[PDB]
């Protein structure tokens, strides 16, 4: 036999998918039929199929041409959101294994809230305070670090909670952020979007707080 262990397992899964269509049955999820073998290998492959499923799990127009779906601005927009949701969740798992030694170890004690996780993530990745931070701290951590890694993990709510406890320090950023969390597609209104950009460009193009720049 010329098929390696992995290849053979895939063949069997493709036989099922064929047996289903040959007997007229329900069209099963191919992506699921392939990830079934991935778990038998290292996670290098499992995390791939996870990306494949999430990048292909977009509302499509059945019985429509391939080129048309991929040219439509409608579909092209959802791809960006599905990827961002993968990069955010993927990073969230990196933040867990960074605090706890094993995913299992984190689970038994219970996944903490994205806020407390991020806080327990800042402890490690910045043990000493950087002298260039701005806008003070919040419960022992720089306010902008919390906002960034919360947005990076994809929990805008956890980030907005941080903002609510620093209303006086952050200035007008509150009304701007609260609009970003509300507006869909992660975009602000052109008027308000113009107000903040010009302010940042005005005197904050080079600020000593990198987290502030990023957000």
């Amino acid at each position: 036999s010329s098929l390696d262990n992995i290849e053979m397992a895939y063949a069997r899964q493709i036989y099922i998918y064929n047996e289903k269509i040959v007997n007229g049955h329900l069209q099963p999820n191919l992506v699921d039929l392939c990830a079934s073998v991935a778990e038998l290998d290292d996670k290098s492959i499992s995390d791939m199929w996870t990306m494949v499923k999430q990048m292909t799990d977009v509302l499509l127009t059945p019985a429509t041409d391939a080129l048309k779906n991929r040219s439509s601005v409608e579909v092209r927009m959802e791809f960006v959101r599905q990827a961002l949701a993968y990069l955010e969740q993927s990073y969230k798992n990196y933040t867990l294994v960074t605090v706890f030694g094993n995913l299992h170890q984190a689970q038994l004690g219970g996944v903490p809230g994205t806020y407390q996780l991020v806080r327990s993530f800042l402890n490690i990745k910045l043990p000493a305070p950087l002298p260039g931070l701005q806008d003070g701290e919040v419960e022992g951590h720089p306010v902008w670090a919390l906002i960034y890694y919360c947005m990076r993990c994809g929990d805008l709510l956890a980030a907005s909670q941080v903002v609510n406890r620093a209303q006086h320090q952050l200035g007008e950023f509150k009304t701007w952020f609260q609009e970003y969390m509300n507006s869909k597609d992660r975009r602000l209104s052109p008027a308000t979007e113009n107000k903040l950009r010009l302010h940042y460009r005005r005197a904050l193009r080079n600020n000593t707080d990198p987290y502030k720049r990023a957000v």
Binding site: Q105, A106, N123
Partner: protein, 286 residues
């Protein structure tokens, strides 16, 4: 004059007054002489001022056992600030004040006496910083997980002993080695508590201990993440890197605690490699 030069009375022109006070401290401080030597009035003045800055501390017990501190923290801060401003004053005038710069037997013992006082000042500041660090944590928690002899030694530890006697230094080295252990259980931040102990109370902390603390950090946090599969092989592998660096300086008590944890995490082959490495670095010449 020394006190005014250090800003005392200024809680009430002021630069010129302090500069005049400096001039009086230098010009009229006298000099050392053979009578066994008689040190200058400048030396006795420095000893008198320094003593009065710490008179409420010296003979007092550090702690009161629910353990707490004998001296309020706010008082320890002001005392430390006063000691540091005195030190800052001596440094800014190391070239103009007689006896600070190195220089016949009279001026010799004058230099030695002044040097000893300055070493006590930095030791006082380190000692105070250590006590403040201690009570920032949860001392009662640390005090519970402690042996009786060390509880008793801490019970009757005075500030004098902490500042000027080896047992205070040895006990201080035990407490720091214990607080970091506890800090890892809380697990807020290891590398911040590191840089805290590394610099301010240096000459009492050891850089080979913080790297060890960094190693025991990943070890305990590898036991924290123990349920996860892919996160440990980075924690345990990096803990192993940290241990092998301070191999020529690991205590048998730590090396054991490391191997004990490695076995819990089925990290057999790795733990063997650490012990073998610690061996070679204790005896390189074979």
């Amino acid at each position: 004059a020394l006190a005014v030069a250090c800003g005392q009375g200024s809680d009430l022109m002021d630069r010129n007054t302090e500069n005049l006070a400096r001039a009086a401290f230098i010009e009229y401080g006298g000099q050392p002489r053979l009578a066994s030597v008689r040190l200058s009035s400048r030396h006795d003045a420095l000893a008198l001022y320094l003593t009065r800055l710490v008179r409420t501390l010296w003979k007092a017990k550090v702690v009161q056992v629910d353990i707490s501190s004998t001296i309020p923290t706010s008082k320890l801060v002001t005392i430390q600030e006063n000691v540091e401003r005195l030190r800052n004053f001596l440094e800014a005038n190391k070239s103009t004040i007689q006896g600070l710069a190195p220089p016949d037997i009279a001026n010799q013992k004058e230099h030695q006496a002044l040097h000893a006082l300055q070493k006590l000042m930095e030791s006082i500041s380190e000692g105070i910083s250590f006590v403040l660090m201690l009570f920032d944590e949860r001392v009662s928690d640390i005090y519970a997980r402690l042996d009786a002899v060390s509880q008793q030694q801490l019970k009757d530890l005075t500030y004098e002993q902490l500042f000027s006697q080896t047992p205070g230094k040895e006990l201080a080295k035990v407490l720091v080695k214990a607080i970091v252990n506890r800090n890892i259980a809380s697990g807020a931040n290891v590398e911040t508590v590191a840089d805290a102990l590394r610099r301010r109370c240096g000459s009492f902390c050891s850089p080979d201990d913080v790297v060890t603390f960094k190693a025991q950090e990943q070890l305990q946090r590898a036991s924290e993440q123990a349920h996860n599969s892919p996160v440990l092989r980075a924690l345990l592998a990096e803990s192993l890197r940290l241990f092998e660096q301070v191999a020529g300086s690991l205590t048998p008590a730590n090396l054991t605690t490391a191997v004990e944890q490695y076995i819990s995490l089925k990290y057999y082959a790795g733990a063997i490699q650490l012990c073998l490495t610690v061996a070679q670095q204790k005896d390189r010449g074979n």
